Short mmCIF file of C-alpha atoms (C1' of nucleotides) in Angstrom, two decimals:
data_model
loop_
_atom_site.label_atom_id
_atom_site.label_comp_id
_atom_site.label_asym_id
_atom_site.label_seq_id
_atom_site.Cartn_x
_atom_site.Cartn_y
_atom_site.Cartn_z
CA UNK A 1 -22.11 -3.74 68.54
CA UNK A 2 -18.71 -2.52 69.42
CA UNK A 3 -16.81 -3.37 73.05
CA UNK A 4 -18.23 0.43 74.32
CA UNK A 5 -21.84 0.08 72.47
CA UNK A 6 -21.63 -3.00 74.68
CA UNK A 7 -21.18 -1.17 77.68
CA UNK A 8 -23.25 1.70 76.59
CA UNK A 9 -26.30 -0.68 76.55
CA UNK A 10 -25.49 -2.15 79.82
CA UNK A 11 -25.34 0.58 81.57
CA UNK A 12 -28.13 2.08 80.15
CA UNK A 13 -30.43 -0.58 81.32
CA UNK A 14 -28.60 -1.11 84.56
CA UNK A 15 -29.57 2.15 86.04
CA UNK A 16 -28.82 0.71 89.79
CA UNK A 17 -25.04 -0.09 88.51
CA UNK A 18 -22.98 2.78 88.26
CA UNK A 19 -21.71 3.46 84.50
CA UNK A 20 -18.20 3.52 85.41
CA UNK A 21 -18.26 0.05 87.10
CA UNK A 22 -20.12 -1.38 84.17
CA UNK A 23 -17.42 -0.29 82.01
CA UNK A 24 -14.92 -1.90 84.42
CA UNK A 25 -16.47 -4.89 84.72
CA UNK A 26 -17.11 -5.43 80.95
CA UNK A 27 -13.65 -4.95 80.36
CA UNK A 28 -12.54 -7.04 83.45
CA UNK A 29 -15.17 -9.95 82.08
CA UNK A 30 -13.30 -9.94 78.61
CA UNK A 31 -9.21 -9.70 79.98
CA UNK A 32 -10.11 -12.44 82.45
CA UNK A 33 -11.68 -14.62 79.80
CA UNK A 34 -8.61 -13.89 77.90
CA UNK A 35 -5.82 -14.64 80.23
CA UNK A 36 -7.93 -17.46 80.53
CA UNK A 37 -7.44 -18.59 76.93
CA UNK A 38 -3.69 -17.52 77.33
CA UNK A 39 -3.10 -19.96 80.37
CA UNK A 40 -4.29 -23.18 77.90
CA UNK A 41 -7.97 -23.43 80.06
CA UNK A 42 -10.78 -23.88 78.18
CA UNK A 43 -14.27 -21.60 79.11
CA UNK A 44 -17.69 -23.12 79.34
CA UNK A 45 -20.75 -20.42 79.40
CA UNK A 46 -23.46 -22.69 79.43
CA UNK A 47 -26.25 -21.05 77.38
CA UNK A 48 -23.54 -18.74 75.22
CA UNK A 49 -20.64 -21.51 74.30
CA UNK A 50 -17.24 -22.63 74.82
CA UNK A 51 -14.35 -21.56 73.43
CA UNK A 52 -11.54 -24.06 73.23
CA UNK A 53 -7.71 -24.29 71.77
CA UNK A 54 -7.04 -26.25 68.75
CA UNK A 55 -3.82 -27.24 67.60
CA UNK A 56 -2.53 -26.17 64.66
CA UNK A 57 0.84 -28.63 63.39
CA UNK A 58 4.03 -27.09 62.37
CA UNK A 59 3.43 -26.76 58.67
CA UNK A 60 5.62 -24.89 55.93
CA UNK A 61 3.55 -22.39 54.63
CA UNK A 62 3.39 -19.04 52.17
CA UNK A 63 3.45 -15.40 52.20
CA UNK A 64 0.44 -15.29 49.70
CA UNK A 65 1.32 -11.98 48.06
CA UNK A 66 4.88 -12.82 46.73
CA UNK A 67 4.82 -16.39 46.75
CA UNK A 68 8.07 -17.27 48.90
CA UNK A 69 8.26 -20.40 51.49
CA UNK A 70 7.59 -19.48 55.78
CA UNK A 71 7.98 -21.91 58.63
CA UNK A 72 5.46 -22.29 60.24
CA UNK A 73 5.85 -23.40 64.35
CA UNK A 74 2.98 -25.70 65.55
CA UNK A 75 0.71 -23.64 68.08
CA UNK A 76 -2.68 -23.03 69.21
CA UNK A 77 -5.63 -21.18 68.05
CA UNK A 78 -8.99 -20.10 70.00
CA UNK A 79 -12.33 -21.85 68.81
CA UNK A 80 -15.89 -20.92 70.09
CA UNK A 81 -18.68 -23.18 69.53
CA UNK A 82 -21.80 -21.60 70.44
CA UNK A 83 -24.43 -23.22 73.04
CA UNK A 84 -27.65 -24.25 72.16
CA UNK A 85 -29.83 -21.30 73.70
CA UNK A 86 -27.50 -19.25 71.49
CA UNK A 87 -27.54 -21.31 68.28
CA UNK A 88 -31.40 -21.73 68.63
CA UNK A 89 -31.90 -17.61 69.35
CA UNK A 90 -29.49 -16.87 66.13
CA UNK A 91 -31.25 -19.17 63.71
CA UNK A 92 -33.82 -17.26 61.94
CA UNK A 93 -34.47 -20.78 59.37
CA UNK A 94 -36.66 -23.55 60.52
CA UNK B 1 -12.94 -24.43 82.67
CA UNK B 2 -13.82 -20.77 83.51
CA UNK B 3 -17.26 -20.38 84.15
CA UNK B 4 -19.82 -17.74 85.07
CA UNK B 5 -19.08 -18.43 89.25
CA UNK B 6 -15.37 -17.81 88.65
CA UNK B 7 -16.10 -14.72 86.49
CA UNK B 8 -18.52 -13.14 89.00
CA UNK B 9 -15.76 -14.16 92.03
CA UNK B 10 -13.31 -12.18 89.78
CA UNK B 11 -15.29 -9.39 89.58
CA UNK B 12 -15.36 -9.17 93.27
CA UNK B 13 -12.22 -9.30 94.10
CA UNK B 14 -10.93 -7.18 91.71
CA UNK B 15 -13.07 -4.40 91.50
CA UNK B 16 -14.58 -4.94 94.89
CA UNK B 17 -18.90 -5.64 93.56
CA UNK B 18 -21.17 -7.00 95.74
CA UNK B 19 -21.16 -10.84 94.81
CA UNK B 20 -25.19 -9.72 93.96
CA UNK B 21 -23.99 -7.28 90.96
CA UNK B 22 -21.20 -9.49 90.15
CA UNK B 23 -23.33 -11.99 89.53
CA UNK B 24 -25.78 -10.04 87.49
CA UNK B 25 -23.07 -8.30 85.46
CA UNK B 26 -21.31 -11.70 84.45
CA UNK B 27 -24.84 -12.85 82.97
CA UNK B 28 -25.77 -9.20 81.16
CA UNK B 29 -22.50 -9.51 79.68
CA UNK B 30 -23.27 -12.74 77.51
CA UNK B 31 -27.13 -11.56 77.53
CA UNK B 32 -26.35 -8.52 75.83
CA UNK B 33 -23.90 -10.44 73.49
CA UNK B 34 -26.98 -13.00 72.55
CA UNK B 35 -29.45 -9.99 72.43
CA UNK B 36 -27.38 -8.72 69.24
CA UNK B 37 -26.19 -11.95 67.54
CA UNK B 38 -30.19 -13.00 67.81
CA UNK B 39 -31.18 -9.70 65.97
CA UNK B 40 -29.46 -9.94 63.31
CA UNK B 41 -25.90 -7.82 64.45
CA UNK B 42 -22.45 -8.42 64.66
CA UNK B 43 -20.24 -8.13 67.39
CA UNK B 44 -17.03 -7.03 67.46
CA UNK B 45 -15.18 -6.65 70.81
CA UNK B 46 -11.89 -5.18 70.00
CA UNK B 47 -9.06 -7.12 72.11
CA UNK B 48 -11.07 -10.57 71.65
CA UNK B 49 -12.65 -11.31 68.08
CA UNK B 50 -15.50 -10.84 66.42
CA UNK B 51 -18.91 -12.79 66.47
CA UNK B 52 -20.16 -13.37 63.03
CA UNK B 53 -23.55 -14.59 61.13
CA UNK B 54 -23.46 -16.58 58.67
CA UNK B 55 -26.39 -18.28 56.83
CA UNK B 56 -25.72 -21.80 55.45
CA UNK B 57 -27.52 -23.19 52.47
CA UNK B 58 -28.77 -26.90 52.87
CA UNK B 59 -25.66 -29.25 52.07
CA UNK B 60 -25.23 -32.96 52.44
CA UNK B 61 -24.93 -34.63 55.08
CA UNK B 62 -25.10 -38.11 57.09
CA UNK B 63 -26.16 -40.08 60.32
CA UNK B 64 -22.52 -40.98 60.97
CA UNK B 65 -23.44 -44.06 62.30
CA UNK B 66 -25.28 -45.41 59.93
CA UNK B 67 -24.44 -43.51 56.45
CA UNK B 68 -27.69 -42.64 55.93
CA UNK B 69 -27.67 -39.89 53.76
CA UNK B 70 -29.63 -36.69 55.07
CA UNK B 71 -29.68 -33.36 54.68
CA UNK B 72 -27.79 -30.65 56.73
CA UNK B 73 -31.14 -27.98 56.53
CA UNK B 74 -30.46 -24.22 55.59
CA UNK B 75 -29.87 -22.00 59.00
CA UNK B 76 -28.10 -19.15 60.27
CA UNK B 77 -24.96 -19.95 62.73
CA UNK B 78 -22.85 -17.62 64.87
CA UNK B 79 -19.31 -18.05 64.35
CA UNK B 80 -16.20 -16.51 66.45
CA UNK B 81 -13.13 -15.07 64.55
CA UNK B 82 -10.56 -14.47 67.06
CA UNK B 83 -8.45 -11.28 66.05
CA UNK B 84 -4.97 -11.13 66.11
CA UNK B 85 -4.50 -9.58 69.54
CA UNK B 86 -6.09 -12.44 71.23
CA UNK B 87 -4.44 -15.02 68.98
CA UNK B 88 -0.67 -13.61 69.66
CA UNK B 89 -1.39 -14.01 73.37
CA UNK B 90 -3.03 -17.57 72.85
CA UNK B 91 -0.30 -19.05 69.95
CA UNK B 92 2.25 -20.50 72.75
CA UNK B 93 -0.20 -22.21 75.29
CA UNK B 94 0.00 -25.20 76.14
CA UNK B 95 -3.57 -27.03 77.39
CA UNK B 96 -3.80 -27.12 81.16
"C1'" DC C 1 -22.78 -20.89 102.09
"C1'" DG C 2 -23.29 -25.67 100.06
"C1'" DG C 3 -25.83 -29.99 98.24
"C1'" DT C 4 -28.10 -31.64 94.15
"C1'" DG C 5 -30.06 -33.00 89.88
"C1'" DC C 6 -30.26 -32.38 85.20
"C1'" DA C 7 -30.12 -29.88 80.54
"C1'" DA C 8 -26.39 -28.74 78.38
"C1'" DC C 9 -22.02 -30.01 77.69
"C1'" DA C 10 -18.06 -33.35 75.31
"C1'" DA C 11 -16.70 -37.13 72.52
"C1'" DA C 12 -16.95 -40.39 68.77
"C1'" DT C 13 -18.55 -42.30 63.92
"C1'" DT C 14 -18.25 -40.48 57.50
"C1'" DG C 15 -17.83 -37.65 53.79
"C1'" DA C 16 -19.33 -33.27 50.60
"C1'" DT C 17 -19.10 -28.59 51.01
"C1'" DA C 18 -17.84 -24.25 53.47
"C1'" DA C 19 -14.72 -21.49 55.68
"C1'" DG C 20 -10.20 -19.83 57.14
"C1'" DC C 21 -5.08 -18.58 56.52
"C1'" DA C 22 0.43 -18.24 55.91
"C1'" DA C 23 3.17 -12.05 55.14
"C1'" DT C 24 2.80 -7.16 55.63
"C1'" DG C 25 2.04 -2.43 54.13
"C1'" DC C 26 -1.55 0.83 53.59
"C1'" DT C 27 -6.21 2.38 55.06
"C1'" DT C 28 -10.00 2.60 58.34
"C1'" DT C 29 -12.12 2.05 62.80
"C1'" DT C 30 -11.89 1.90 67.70
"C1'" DT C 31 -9.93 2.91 72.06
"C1'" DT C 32 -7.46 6.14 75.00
"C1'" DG C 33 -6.54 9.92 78.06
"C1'" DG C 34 -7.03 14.92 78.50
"C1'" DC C 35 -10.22 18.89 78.53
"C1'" DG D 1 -21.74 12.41 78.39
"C1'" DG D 2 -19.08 15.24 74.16
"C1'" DC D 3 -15.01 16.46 71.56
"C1'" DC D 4 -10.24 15.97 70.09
"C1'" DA D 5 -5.54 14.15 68.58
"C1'" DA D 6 -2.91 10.24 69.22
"C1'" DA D 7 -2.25 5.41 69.46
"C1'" DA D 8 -3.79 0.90 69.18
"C1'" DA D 9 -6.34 -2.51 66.76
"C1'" DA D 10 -8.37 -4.06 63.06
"C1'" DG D 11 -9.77 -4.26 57.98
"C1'" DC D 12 -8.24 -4.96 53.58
"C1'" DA D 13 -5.62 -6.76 49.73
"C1'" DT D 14 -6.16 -12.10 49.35
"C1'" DT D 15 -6.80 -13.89 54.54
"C1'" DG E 1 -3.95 -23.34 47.14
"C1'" DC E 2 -4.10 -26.11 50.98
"C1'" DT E 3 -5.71 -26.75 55.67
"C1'" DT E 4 -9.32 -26.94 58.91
"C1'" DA E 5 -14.35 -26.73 60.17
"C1'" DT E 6 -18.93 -27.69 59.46
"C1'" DC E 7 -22.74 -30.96 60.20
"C1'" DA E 8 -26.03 -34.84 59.73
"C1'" DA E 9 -28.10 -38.95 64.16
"C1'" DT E 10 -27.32 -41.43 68.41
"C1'" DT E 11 -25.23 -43.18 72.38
"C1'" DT E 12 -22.54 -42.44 76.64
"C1'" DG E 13 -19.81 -40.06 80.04
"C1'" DT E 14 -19.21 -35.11 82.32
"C1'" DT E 15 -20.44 -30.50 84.37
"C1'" DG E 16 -22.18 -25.67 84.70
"C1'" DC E 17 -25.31 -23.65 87.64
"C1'" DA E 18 -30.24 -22.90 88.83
"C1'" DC E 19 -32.67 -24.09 92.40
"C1'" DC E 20 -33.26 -25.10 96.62
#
DNA sequence: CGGTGCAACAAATTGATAAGCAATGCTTTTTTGGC
DNA sequence: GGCCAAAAAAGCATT
DNA sequence: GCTTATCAATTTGTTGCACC
């Protein structure tokens, strides 16, 4: 499922929402929760997850195809950890 | 921490909803996400990252605690790869 | 609208095994804006 | 909505 | 190749948000 299957589906069974605003809302949802990220604040879906920054320490590391030495600055990286009603409907195990 | 109440307020400001379809929207949105994940497909929402399956074999593990050695049981998890869009934009902030 | 209670959240333990990534050009998919 | 060419984003190599 | 994440069980402090 793509970002416009997505909305396809949405709309679809949101007959009562125009198609148009379900598109701009989708797209709204996903820019705000990234600006979010962008502006260092953690988001909390209870139900879906969280997705967090980690650090990531200024390291000297390699271009892996030919081998030569990169500096690397220390930064931050996005992490989800999905919520329990999500972990529990994913798991098809015992 | 964003949440779905400052989403849904977003949405109404912005693109002018009814705080009743905001609402509703804001909850579809991760429903339809979970609907996917749950059955087996991956999502990939170009701009953000992708959300992955993965099925884990049983490994080791431990009550921390303790040290009481148990086993981590075989399941399927949903992981998040971020793409590089969203990581570019992310890489220089700094935690509120 | 706003107060409230509580499941779901976060954090913290240890250690074996799994997953992810530095660069960057070429290829493939997805989005975009006009009809 | 479909279709299309162009651009953006991602996928791959290996990441 | 080397770095970072995954997870066990359990306790303790915090909060998204459904429900009034």
């Amino acid at each position: 499922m793509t970002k416009s299957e997505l909305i396809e589906r949405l709309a679809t069974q949101q007959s009562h929402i125009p198609a148009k605003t379900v598109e701009d809302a989708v797209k709204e949802m996903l820019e705000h929760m990234a600006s979010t990220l962008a502006q260092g604040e953690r988001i909390e879906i209870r139900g879906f997850g969280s997705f967090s920054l980690h650090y990531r320490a200024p390291r000297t590391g390699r271009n892996p195809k030919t081998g030569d030495k990169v500096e690397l600055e220390g930064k931050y990286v996005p992490h989800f950890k999905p919520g329990k009603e999500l972990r529990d409907r994913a798991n098809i195990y015992g | 921490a964003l949440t779905k109440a400052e989403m849904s307020e977003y949405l109404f400001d912005k693109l002018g909803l009814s705080k009743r379809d905001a609402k509703e929207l804001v909850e579809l949105f991760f429903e339809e996400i979970r609907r996917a994940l749950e059955n087996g497909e991956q999502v990939k929402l170009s701009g953000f990252g992708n959300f992955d399956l993965r099925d884990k074999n049983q490994r080791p593990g431990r009550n921390p605690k303790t040290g009481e050695d148990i086993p981590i049981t075989a399941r399927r998890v949903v992981t998040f790869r971020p793409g590089q869009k969203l990581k570019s934009r992310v890489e220089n902030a700094s935690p509120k």
